[model samples]
Target chain A: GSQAAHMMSMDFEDFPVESAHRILTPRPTVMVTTVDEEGNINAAPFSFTMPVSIDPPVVAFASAPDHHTARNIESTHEFVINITPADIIERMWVTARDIPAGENELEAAGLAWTSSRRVKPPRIVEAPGHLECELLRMFEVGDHNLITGSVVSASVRSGAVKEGLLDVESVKPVLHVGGNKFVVGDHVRHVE
Target chain B: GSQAAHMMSMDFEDFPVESAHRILTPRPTVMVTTVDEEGNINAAPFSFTMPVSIDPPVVAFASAPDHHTARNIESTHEFVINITPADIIERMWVTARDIPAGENELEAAGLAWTSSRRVKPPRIVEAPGHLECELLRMFEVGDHNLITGSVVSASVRSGAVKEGLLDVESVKPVLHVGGNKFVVGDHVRHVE
Candidate 1:
């Protein structure tokens, strides 16, 4: 796809409403893993994922109903959030490719996986972190379904993370700025 | 606050669920501005915000119902999301200081703002971009209320943005990893 135009448009009429979401760019990108009752697993890249609650440890992401990942989660109510590293960004995108429900997206993306200790969904072992979650609730919000999940368990790889957070300077996490564009958080800035 | 322990935890027992949200760390941070019925303005930084739709241009964030920003938007049904650059992140956090409902957090944060074109909330002039929005709906999701908004207007600072996205290489957008720890998006990588 061609690039969007860049110009200052302060008025509502000056800019396209469809591009309004651009204001929230540089969103963290991650792979969502889900499994069907049949044991077939699916993985898809999501840039809109977020942590929704603290005490109950809830997380959320918006997905269209037709997505295989969404369908799998709706059926089994379990999923794993797989953090994306810049090294695997290309393969992560590959998982977004649409395939038959029975086809395994993990293998298609060449992602190595292991069973999440709490949820049935497979965790992409290569990812620096994984959060296992069970469906908390789902709501139809506009054109997408806002999927919420209660995190049941979580884990992170050694060395790349420090003090319960991704070492932004060393991890080279893939953060989405837009289509075909991502940013590797290259430096850490400590606020006084 | 004291720093969290640094170590790899492969099992649920090894990590605390309270800190499970850390897996989604280094999230993009933004200032959400809102106004009350009396035109009392408020500004608070949010790291849980994300784009929720495409056609209607909806955005959503998780907030406690008691939050002034949440209360303001609940009453006035209007808000503006201001993109936080590294330069203004300190003031952005200052807006989070607890103040009474009738007080304006903008002035307290030393922020300069202008009226939003389509909403009652004030847009931070120092922000790199602004998305004026009207409330779409609010949902009770666990301990946090999930607020969705339809962006009615948006604007970006010139030159730093390109192709409908923040130029990650030069923008140095502030991303929150955990408490008091933020990352500067300093480099862009294009996937082949």
Candidate 2:
């Protein structure tokens, strides 16, 4: 479709195929926590996440199969999703580095954690909210695995949510646009 | 999980199970377009969306199985996901109304349309970007269904994405926190 500067049809060949996700950019970013077989904690930020169901309170996210978090969940069958606000974004990014296995990335990132209510994986205490989950299943799609988990427990900071909805204005949750760039959910637009 | 205003564990039995999805708030909002067996068009806004894979370039979103959008998708096996920006935020919400089948929600929402190259479903011209997808599969998850599709085509407005990354500051993609409330991806935090 040609509409001059207003709209331009992108050729798939123009950009790296890996960057196709840019089309769905600026997605809500969540910090995922998992434990290795020996209970070594791992924390990583994943923006490729979504709530897949409500009846069973399920959520899903995709990651490379070899990712430490995915492998950890594979063995432990448990993980925690921390709804991270922008305040601790630096620590969250620290976890994204390829730190060696069994190394406490949380500690390396200067983040604090505590035992989760329903999972072996620890939850990031700095994050405003958390969802302790158990692995429901995983589907291998190409080079990544689409993982689903039953949200066993969901929690948030007292004032982070209002009337069952997130008070994003105050929390300023992180949304990843791409490498090293993020959007903060700091404002809301109310429509009729 | 006891830190007063800064930390509060959400009791599952407290709020409606439907609101459980709230834990994954402020997700990227996309307007999905689909066509029924009769080629009748449907459009709806979905906030529970994410990029499910990178290599094969897949994306997924969850919707109530009974929704007209799901029905049309189930029939036609093709849909176009429009990456809407704040400029058309009101029109995007206009599509969320419970409009009837074949009613052409695009028209009701005052959104213009154009033919997609690889999908039967049309694309919203006003939206900054689009992913024309073919139904890769569907998973029944409780009362809702998670739908995955192969990105048959991806395109965007000329200046929307810069260097394989979304220029969120300029595009200001729409993100939903809850009913009638959304966060605009208007600002970016670039970290080292």
Candidate 3:
């Protein structure tokens, strides 16, 4: 097609920057608490964790500039992005408690873990499915930041798999629609 | 509203990232391309574009580190984020081409331009709407860096706007699923 080269112009200030900020937003995020070297734990919520590339098995999550969990991810080189399913929505909220620095919130929140293969961060033992990723790259976009994780290990809980996919319909994961409220993420559609 | 934490855990290594590097996950993305001082055009597609705040009427997009677009944006502090409506999927593929530093793909592709209010970059006139931006605070993650742009101008082409919203359903925006394939986003009900 012979595309056009010029169009009319408009003043920039009239269009608020907010008009485009939330357009391509991500799902509801779970606050992951990790212990630093000093054993302090931090909790923060984010919604931009997206799977940017999958060939190398990588996913990206955006974090607040001052959020502690993301910073811990930077210092440790590994962290677990636990997919909070409906079965554990309440428990996911519990995992978000603001604990002291250098403290392990998993134990405080009564969560269990196994040693991770790709990195030093411990993995959650109970989530229906999980992606253990090694830090590939972290990109900052304005006040929010993006962390890309290379999938080192992945598995779905027994009976959670249907056909080949994660069976989100059965798993019924929680999804964020921005502002705090979330809806049930179920039913699958084959993308064209 | 009272809050509760979901204390869930996953095995770090066994955690799941996306299966492929560029198969697509979720999020709305706009591509930013520019004509340099020498008038040569440079472009790169981005998925971090979104509306952040409404009062000042601002829209923003993040330019990551270690990429041509990010570096160009840093040096010039201006670029147009071209919204790739689903119908023009192929053009986005073209924009992703590994072009040289001083090439103006917009001119080659025959895209139009609008004057920017906040920065030197010209808005992509053909794009559904152009959000001119200024450098907000930069958020630095591990490897990927983020540059926030404030919206300076916005417009709708070919009846793209509906009911005061961009109306992705009506305009038919293209979403980056992973790599080459673009998904025509389905209308998922918003969570109240």
Provide the TM-score for each candidate, comma-separated: 0.90, 0.92, 0.60
Better of 2 and 3 by TM-score: 2
Q: Provide the TM-score of chain B versus the true chain B for each model in turn.
A: 0.89, 0.90, 0.76
Model 3: lDDT of residue A153 = 70
lDDT of 3 by residue, A1-192 (tens): 123323243322243345453333324344453446654544444555555443446566666645677678778767666655566565565655666566666666555565545556654555555566677766555556556677777655665554444445566655544443444545343333
Off by over 4 Å in 2: A1-18, B1-18
Compute the lDDT of residue A78 as modeled in candidate 3.
72
Q: Which stretches of candidate 3 lie over 4 Å from their true place?
A: A1-13, A24-45, A50-79, A83-192, B1-24, B48-68, B107-110, B136-166
* B49-86 per-residue lDDT for model 3 (tens digits): 44434444434454556567776766776666666666
Candidate 3 reference-contact recovery: 0.21
How many angstroms is the interface RMSD of candidate 2?
3.8
Q: Least lDDT summed over 10 consecutive residues: which range in candidate 3 chain B?
A: B1-10
Pairwise DockQ winner, candidates 2 and 3: 2
- Candidate 2, residues A24-68, lDDT tens digits: the string is 978888889998988788888899999988878889999899999
Give the better candidate number (1 or 3) by DockQ: 1
Instruction: Compute the DockQ of candidate 3.
Output: 0.19
